[PDB]
Amino acid sequence: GVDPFERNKILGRGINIGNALEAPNEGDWGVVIKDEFFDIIKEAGFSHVRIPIRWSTHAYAFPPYKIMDRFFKRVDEVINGALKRGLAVVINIHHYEELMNDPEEHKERFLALWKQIADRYKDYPETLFFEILNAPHGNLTPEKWNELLEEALKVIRSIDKKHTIIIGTAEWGGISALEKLSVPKWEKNSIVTIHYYNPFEFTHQGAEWVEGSEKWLGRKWGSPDDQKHLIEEFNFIEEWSKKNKRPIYIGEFGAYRKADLESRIKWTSFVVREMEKRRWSWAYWEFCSGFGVYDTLRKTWNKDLLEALIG
Numbered sequence: 001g002v003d004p005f006e007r008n009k010i011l012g013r014g015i016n017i018g019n020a021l022e023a024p025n026e027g028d029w030g031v032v033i034k035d036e037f038f039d040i041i042k043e044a045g046f047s048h049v050r051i052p053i054r055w056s057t058h059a060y061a062f063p064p065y066k067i068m069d070r071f072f073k074r075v076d077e078v079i080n081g082a083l084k085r086g087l088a089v090v091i092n093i094h095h096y097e098e099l100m101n102d103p104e105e106h107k108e109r110f111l112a113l114w115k116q117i118a119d120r121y122k123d124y125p126e127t128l129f130f131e132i133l134n135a136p137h138g139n140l141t142p143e144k145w146n147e148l149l150e151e152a153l154k155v156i157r158s159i160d161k162k163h164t165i166i167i168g169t170a171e172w173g174g175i176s177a178l179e180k181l182s183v184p185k186w187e188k189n190s191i192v193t194i195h196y197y198n199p200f201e202f203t204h205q206g207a208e209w210v211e212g213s214e215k216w217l218g219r220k221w222g223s224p225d226d227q228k229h230l231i232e233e234f235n236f237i238e239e240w241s242k243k244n245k246r247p248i249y250i251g252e253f254g255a256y257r258k259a260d261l262e263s264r265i266k267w268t269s270f271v272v273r274e275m276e277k278r279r280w281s282w283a284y285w286e287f288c289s290g291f292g293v294y295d296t297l298r299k300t301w302n303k304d305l306l307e308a309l310i311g
């Protein structure tokens with residue numbers, strides 16, 4: 001008997017602390033989650049934090065696919081750590097690449113990973129949300145994603161019908177596969193998340209993990225017809241949601257540092273406003289790393305960028 005929409009506003013605006021737990025090992029990618037971070041975030045005025053987690057490398061590959069305890073223990077440190085500063089939290093299964101290239105083979109392990117996770121946290125504050133799986137793609141096609149997400153729901157609810165669940169989209173989590181999304185009729189406490197990076201060439205200009213991203217380096221943002229496109233996409237989102245009775249959460253959105261601060265502030269500000277206009281919850285892609293809004297070793301936010309994220 002929970003209202004997801006009421007839960008979506010609880011979540012509100014927040015941010016990702018990535019390049020952390022979704023890396024092969026925490027640190028591998030530069031960021032190690034400090035307990036103090038939750039202070040900055042809170043005092044900073046954020047309602048929640050999203051913590052991407054790569055469980056797939058911290059769990060046995062043979063039945064019953066048990067999750068290794070030191071890691072599990074580490075996630076606990078991070079959960080209550082955010083809960084302290086009164087921040088709400090979103091955890092998920094992030095970068096499970098073998099599942100994206102061979103779903104059927106890893107489907108079993110996946111369902112098992114959630115059974116464990118849901119149980120481990122089934123009685124935690126209701127301000128903790130469960131994100132099924134980050135940006136399904138590859139061979140984990142849209143129609144196949146629908147089947148897998150439903151079974152994760154059955155795995156979760158059987159353990160708990162208290163926490164709101166976040167369901168993404170396929171084809172890398174953007175709007176391309178939105179239409180094709182199907183959340184079971186019986187699920188009544190879920191939120192739909194979309195990653196919005198749309199001006200991809202702009203947001204990912206120079207992303208070393210994206211092939212051919214070199215041809216984007218140097219792009220700028222802040223033009224007319226420019227926003228009309230994005231606006232029609234936000235409307236598409238909005239129309240889907242109104243016709244599907246599901247709240248929206250923009251789980252990720254941000255511009256890579258190689259873009260010029262100016263067009264990064266214009267895009268963020270714009271998209272944030274368009275997101276609040278439609279009353280969407282959302283989280284800026286990552287706190288301090290290569291997409292950062294807070295420079296770790298130098299203690300200082302990019303206040304303008306931050307000003308754009310905060311109301």
Ligand SMILES: OC[C@H]1O[C@@H](O)[C@H](O)[C@@H](O)[C@@H]1O
Nearest residue numbers: 018134135172173195209252
């Ligand atoms: O690859 C660019 C971005 O794609 C998103 O779908 C992932 O969630 C981010 O972690 C990643 O940085």
